[PDB]
Amino acid sequence: XXVXXXXXVXXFD
Amino acid sequence: XXVXXXXXVXXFD
Secondary structure (H helix, E strand, C coil): CEEEEEEEEEEEC | CEEEEEEEEEEEC
C-alpha cells in the first residue's frame, strides 16, 4: 500500500 | 472522500 493516487482501502479524496 | 474503499488521492493500507 502507500500514498498517492490509486485504489484500495484507506483515507482518500 | 474519507475512510473506506474506493479510488482517489490519499493513503492506502
